[PDB]
Amino acid sequence: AQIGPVTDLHITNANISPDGFSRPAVLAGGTFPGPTIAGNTGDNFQITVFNDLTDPSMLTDTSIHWHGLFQKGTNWADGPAFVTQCPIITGQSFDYNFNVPGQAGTFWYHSHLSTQYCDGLRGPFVVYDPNDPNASLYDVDDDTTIITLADWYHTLAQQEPIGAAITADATLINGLGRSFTNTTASPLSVITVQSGKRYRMRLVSISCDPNYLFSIDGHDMTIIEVDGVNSQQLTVDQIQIFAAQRYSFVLNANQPVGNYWIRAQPNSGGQGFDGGINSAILRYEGATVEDPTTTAPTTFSNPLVETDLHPLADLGVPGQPFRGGADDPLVLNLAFANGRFSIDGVSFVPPTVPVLLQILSGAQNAQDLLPAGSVISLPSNSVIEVALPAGAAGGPHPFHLHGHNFAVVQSANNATPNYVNPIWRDTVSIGGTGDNVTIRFTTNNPGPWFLHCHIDWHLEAGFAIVFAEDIPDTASANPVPQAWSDLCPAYDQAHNIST
């Protein structure tokens, strides 16, 4: 069952074996992935998070981010540790009380403390639209049509060297899959469809690192949503999905009744499908209960290319139709050396006092804010352009901005910008050497918004900056509840920190 929009959510430690290998984890709602949190557009969500963690090897503090939800007027509820709050300590709880005006689509939630989400705290978050403009394109859209793609590690996250190329031990599809080494024939996930029906499949990358080449043997996929943004229909036979991205696609159950492989090939870790790694099963009602016998093609003739995507609504692009054609045009210098990433020469290390709390206490320019050199102020009611030229090791890097979606004016592997009708999204691959992936948005949401690579190992190694958007209006726009004001005193007391 789905939970929400008003619900408790307990965060616990437990042993799990999603690929046949037992390890302890950090779980929401007792499962991997966590339960789907759901509501309708414009609803009030009140997710009271109970921190019941006791195993220090995965951290006993926590904080949860609602990925892709704008949090307008509720910056304090966004979740990134030391940007918008101090962590929740064990034995305490915290009500994330916010609203979702003007958004409807496929989202997710995850820990936003250190690399803790890798240890299991990840789940889907769906905001349905009772008047969805795409409603007539499918018959079925429910918890059974969500497809999560996850990397899974046998080593605990706090034992992963910082700045290292860290590699997974299994791909999990809807929580199940097989290990790349010492492979055992542990259970695979089954997605069941009825011949003749059309399904809104909500594809969610909950990855900590790899991107996946996703396909379904015998089937194609008609994309209708990208990171919460409705798209024109685009039919493809393969989707390369980067960490934290989402797509809705229509699956037409129009092939013969039978069993078909679902494939998710990561860019690192096990290559291919031997022993049923990187796999799940699409089963038609009435098919024999047996593994598929289907083949992938040698090459995919209609793969997703990001520049083929266009919004369903006339969203356009803010600013003027040339590079630098914005009120505040930025170019970030994105680098890696010696185990640490940097942005504009500064490696991100979380501050002792969360950025939002520094601003509420009166610090009002970005040079007064800590960490020094890690906070860039943005002016209010302005068009922002951010060029993100690739080349830093460990690519391709999927960059994500909190508090906003953005027009993708230039995409990976294509030097031509699009100032007319590019897709809008919230997480974007910045591509490869020589690319100049560029995003635009307008500043109508006061508060500190994190910008970072969504490969969680890279964020931990410093690949982040904070956009302090409209510092002067942050306090008036974001009144804070007493329980939020209580978090840093409680956290610092528990950890013997002076502030």
Ligand X SMILES: *[C@@H]1O[C@H](CO)[C@@H](O[C@@H]2O[C@H](CO)[C@@H](O[C@@H]3O[C@H](CO)[C@@H](O)[C@H](O)[C@@H]3O)[C@H](O)[C@H]2NC(C)=O)[C@H](O)[C@H]1NC(C)=O
CA dist., res. 471 & res. 448, Å (int)? 8
Which residue, 68 or 422, is less far from ligand X as judged by CB?
422
Catalytic status, residue 173: no
Which member of 277, 453, 465, 488 is catalytic? 453
Strand ordering across the sheet containing 212-216: 190-193, 279-284, 259-266, 212-216, 239-241
Catalytic status, residue 67: yes
Residue nearest to ligand X (CB): 324
Which member of 454, 465, 467, 488 is catalytic? 454
Which residue, 5 or 319, is less far from Na ion as judged by CB?
319
Look up tokens 């989400």; give the residue.
117
Binding span for ligand X by CB under 6 A among 184-192, 273-281, 412-420, 481-489: 412-420
Which DSSP string corresponds to 418-459? -SSS--EESEEE--STT---EEEEE--S-EEEEEEESSHHHH
Cα distances (Å, whole numbers) of residue 28 to 50, 90, 99, 109, 298: 9, 14, 21, 10, 39
Q: Is 460 helix (H, G, I), strand (E, B) or coil?
A: helix
Residue 115 partner contact from ligand X, Na ion, Cu ion, none using kind-dependent CB cut-offs of 5 to 8 Å = none
Instruction: Please state, as a whole number, how many other Cβ atoms lie within 10 Å of the Cβ of residue 135.
Output: 12
Catalytic status, residue 453: yes
Positions that interact with Na ion (CB under 5 A) = 316-317
Residue 41 partner contact from Cu ion, ligand X, Na ion, none using kind-dependent CB cut-offs of 5 to 8 Å = none
CB of 103 to ligand X, least distance (A): 25
- Nearest alpha-carbon partner for 268 in 368, 364, 180, 155: 180
- Phi and psi based region of residue 430 (left: phi greater than 0; alpha: psi -120 to 50; beta: remaining): alpha
CB of 326 to Na ion, least distance (A): 11
Residue 317 partner contact from Cu ion, Na ion, ligand X, none using kind-dependent CB cut-offs of 5 to 8 Å = Na ion
Catalytic status, residue 10: no
Q: Give alpha helix (H) positions in 56-211.
A: none
Catalytic status, residue 110: yes
Residue 455 partner contact from Na ion, Cu ion, ligand X, none using kind-dependent CB cut-offs of 5 to 8 Å = Cu ion
The residue from 95, 323, 328, 346 that contacts ligand X (CB under 6 A) is 323
Cα distances (Å, whole numbers) of residue 441 to 17, 175, 344, 406: 42, 35, 20, 5
Residue 453 partner contact from ligand X, Cu ion, Na ion, none using kind-dependent CB cut-offs of 5 to 8 Å = Cu ion
CA dist., res. 367 & res. 74, Å (int)? 24
Torsion of CA 268, 273, 278, 279, to 10 degrees: 170
Q: Spell out where 23-175 has E strands.
A: 23-28, 37-40, 44-51, 64-67, 93-99, 105-111, 122-128, 146-152, 170-173
**Helices and strands (DSSP H and E) totals, the chain:** 5, 31
Q: Please state the residue numbers annotated as binding site for Cu(2+).
A: 65, 67, 110, 112, 397, 400, 402, 452-454, 458
Which residue, 63 or 238, is less far from Cu ion as judged by CB?
63
CB of 455 to Cu ion, least distance (A): 4
Positions that interact with Cu ion (CB under 5 A) = 67, 244, 397, 402, 453, 455, 458
Residue 353 partner contact from Na ion, ligand X, Cu ion, none using kind-dependent CB cut-offs of 5 to 8 Å = none
> Are 280 and 150 in contact, with CB atoms under 8 Å apart?
no
> Are 108 and 124 in contact, with CB atoms under 8 Å apart?
yes
CB of 15 to ligand X, least distance (A): 47
Q: Please state the residue numbers annotated as binding site.
A: 65, 67, 110, 112, 397, 400, 402, 452-454, 458
The residue from 331, 353, 370, 494 that contacts ligand X (CB under 6 A) is 331
387 part of the interface to ligand X, by CB under 6 A = yes
Which member of 397, 423, 441, 450 is catalytic? 397
The residue from 103, 222, 230, 418 that contacts ligand X (CB under 6 A) is 418
Residues 6 or more apart in contact with residue 102 via CB below 8 angstroms:
41, 42, 70
Which member of 384, 452, 465, 488 is catalytic? 452
Residue 204: strand pairing partners:
148, 246
Cα Rg for the chain, rounded, in angstroms?
Answer: 22
Which member of 180, 463, 465, 471 is catalytic? 463
Cα distances (Å, whole numbers) of residue 240 to 217, 398, 429: 15, 12, 10
20 part of the interface to ligand X, by CB under 6 A = no
Helical (H) or strand (E) element with 315 = none
Residue 323 partner contact from Na ion, ligand X, Cu ion, none using kind-dependent CB cut-offs of 5 to 8 Å = ligand X
Which member of 70, 86, 281, 402 is catalytic? 402
CB of 366 to Na ion, least distance (A): 28
Which member of 239, 359, 376, 455 is catalytic? 455
Catalytic status, residue 118: no
CB of 172 to Na ion, least distance (A): 41
Subset of residues 291 to 310 that bind ligand X, contact rule: CB under 6 A: 305, 307
Residue 347 partner contact from Cu ion, ligand X, Na ion, none using kind-dependent CB cut-offs of 5 to 8 Å = none
- Interface with ligand X (CB under 6 A): 305, 307, 323-324, 331, 387, 389, 414, 416, 418, 436, 438
Active-site annotation, residues: 65, 67, 110, 112, 397, 400, 402, 452-455, 458, 463
